[PDB]
């Protein structure tokens, strides 16, 4: 059962993209994709119960040695331990519902089986990433999900902005991939191996944690790397759900939790600044998918700070990752159903009422939104409150500012999520297209993720749930009051007259515009210099006329 969680989504992708799919068509390829995900989810459930609960890790030599020159030895080997089982359960369970949704959402697309094969490849490379036992097979998974993210973001290739969004995701992540590669070189040079179980670091040379942190900041879309994440909304809604829940953005946090070789000052500062920035960014957007994208960036900031706190903080970071994937995928699927019910419009000024959506879509948005804002005794309450209480008792003075930033971020999140519900359903109608979707497949796709939200409350992620870190009632129940403050403010729909702050925040602090000329235009101009002045000029040798 253990190799069935990794191979078999890759097999589904291989089937649906090869000339076998010429004989199946759309109708047969949908069956193949859904079955190939159901099998992998069943295998991951067995792996989860064996490794997490009964504590028996399994190591598999899959395809022998990859390459071995000198003392640099990379093998095709997996290891299934606690983190790997957690990640496999989360990835396969989310990707199954996203496949069941995409087989109905992209029904009218002309190349449906190609899209399903790309989704399966993306899932399989994520499984390869988390199942690897050494750094090089991890890099296979890293670049595989990067390539499949490029193929899926720029799926509608006749649209130029989608193509440029895919290229932007590739380039922004390529900077951090370079830094991560140099960090792998440092790690191997000063420890002698590439396998995770032999990488126990107490005191290393600083470049190790910094360069691995930069490589993780690329994929997890932290500060000065978040710019690709918002533009990745050019792709279809299943792509966004799988990018923001289970694949891609959770890979850097997984890598930092696995290695635990960071220096906590950088991690805490980057995470808290990212959380506050993405909180204020999502409060001032009107595109329905961009608000959810910025909430993803904000929660990744929370997890970054938590893994900065310590080993218990690393466990809480993995726990928040696991519970975040379910309600984030549910939020994106419900938003896709609302968009399709309103004629493709993504602006929240053109919604309202309870006619453009099913009852189940509204229930899904409500329950996932309540889990995200930390409503008591739902799924996100346990993990988010654990991170907040662990940040309130850290003995680092830097974590004092980080906790304040997290509390402000919590109020902002409960503001804009309540605004997303309020604009979508509570206000009067201001669109003109009412085509509500009530198909069986997307409704069952949403119901599965709501079942996982219930499961996280009933069965915890780890042993931290129910442990009491001893805090006064004032410190403990303040995030509930911040949630209520966000709800009351957003339902009052109040606004400020400070329009220059509004347009500074709504334009997202001008990061893209400043990047358009601080590295980008200089790279183009230095290329002009090296070609025209150097190759055609200073180094050019002419002819002798006679």
């Amino acid at each position: 059962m253990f190799l069935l969680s990794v191979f078999f989504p890759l097999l589904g992708g291989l089937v649906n993209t090869s000339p076998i799919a010429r004989f199946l068509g759309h109708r047969g390829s949908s069956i193949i994709a859904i079955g190939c995900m159901v099998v992998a989810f069943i295998s991951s459930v067995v792996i989860y119960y064996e490794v997490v609960f009964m504590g028996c890790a399994v190591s598999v030599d899959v395809f022998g040695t990859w390459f071995s020159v000198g003392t640099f030895h990379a093998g095709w080997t997996f290891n299934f331990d606690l983190l790997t089982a957690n990640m496999l359960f989360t990835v396969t369970g989310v990707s199954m519902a996203v496949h069941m949704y995409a087989c109905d959402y992209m029904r009218q697309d002309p190349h449906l089986n190609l899209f399903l094969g790309y989704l399966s490849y993306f899932t399989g490379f994520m499984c390869v990433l988390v199942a690897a036992d050494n750094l090089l097979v991890m890099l296979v998974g890293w670049e595989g999900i990067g390539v499949c993210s490029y193929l899926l973001i720029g799926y509608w290739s006749h649209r130029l902005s989608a193509v440029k969004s895919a290229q932007k995701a590739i380039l922004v992540n390529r900077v951090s991939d370079g830094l991560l590669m140099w960090g792998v070189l440092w790690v191997w040079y000063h420890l002698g191996s590439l396998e995770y179980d032999l990488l126990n670091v107490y005191s290393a040379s600083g470049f190790v944690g910094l360069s691995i942190l930069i490589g993780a900041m690329g994929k997890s879309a932290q500060i000065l790397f978040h710019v690709w994440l918002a533009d990745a909304m050019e792709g279809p809604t299943p792509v966004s759900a799988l990018i923001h829940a289970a694949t891609l953005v959770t890979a850097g946090v997984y890598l930092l939790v696995r290695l635990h070789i960071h220096d906590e000052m950088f991690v805490i500062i980057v995470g808290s600044l990212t959380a506050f920035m993405a909180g204020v960014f999502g409060a001032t957007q009107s595109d329905l998918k961009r608000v959810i994208a910025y909430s993803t960036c904000s929660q990744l900031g929370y997890m970054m700070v938590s893994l900065g706190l310590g080993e218990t903080g690393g466990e809480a970071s993995m726990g928040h990752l696991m519970t975040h994937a379910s309600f984030k995928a549910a939020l994106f699927l419900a938003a896709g159903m609302v968009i399709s019910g309103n004629g493709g419009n993504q602006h929240i000024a053109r919604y309202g009422g309870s006619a453009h959506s099913a009852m189940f879509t509204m229930l899904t948005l409500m329950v996932a939104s309540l889990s995200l804002i930390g409503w008591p005794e739902l799924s996100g309450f346990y993990s988010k409150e654990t991170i907040l209480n662990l940040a309130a008792i850290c003995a680092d003075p830097i974590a004092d500012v980080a906790h304040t930033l997290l509390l402000l971020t919590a109020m902002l999140t409960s503001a804009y999520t309540t605004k997303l519900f309020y604009q979508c359903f509570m206000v009067d109608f201001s669109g003109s297209s009412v085509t509500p979707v009530r198909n069986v497949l997307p409704i069952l796709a949403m119901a599965i993720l709501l079942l996982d939200i219930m499961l996280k409350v009933w069965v915890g992620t780890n042993l931290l749930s129910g442990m009491l870190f001893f805090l006064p009632w004032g410190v403990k129940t303040l995030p509930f009051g911040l949630m209520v403050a966000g709800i009351l403010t957003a339902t009052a729909a109040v606004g400020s007259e400070r329009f220059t702050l509004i347009r500074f925040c709504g334009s997202r602090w001008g990061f893209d515009q400043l990047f358009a000329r601080s590295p980008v235009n200089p790279i183009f101009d230095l290329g002009r210099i090296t070609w025209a002045i150097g190759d055609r000029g200073l180094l050019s040798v002419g002819n002798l006329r006679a």
Partner: protein
Amino acid sequence: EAKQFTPDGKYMPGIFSKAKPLDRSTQWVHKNPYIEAWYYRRDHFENEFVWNYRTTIEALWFLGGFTAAAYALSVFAFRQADRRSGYPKRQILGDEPAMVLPDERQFY
């Protein structure tokens, strides 16, 4: 509506035929004159080099500047490698007689 094959294979050239045969040049592009002119100009851009102010300044600060930066970095890396390996100062090109090539029979 040309016929370039007999019913049993056997390609026919159609040299004297009225209908236009499909062949290798069927999908050759129709040339835009301005695109051809721009590509010709970029192909011969060495005729446009001139030693004005901007050319001289950018060729000094970027080309010579980064070449000197890379030479300084290479010498820095060489010296630091020799220090972290237990070697004395070693003779690079133009550096007076010194040690080159460590002996394998020696412990450094």
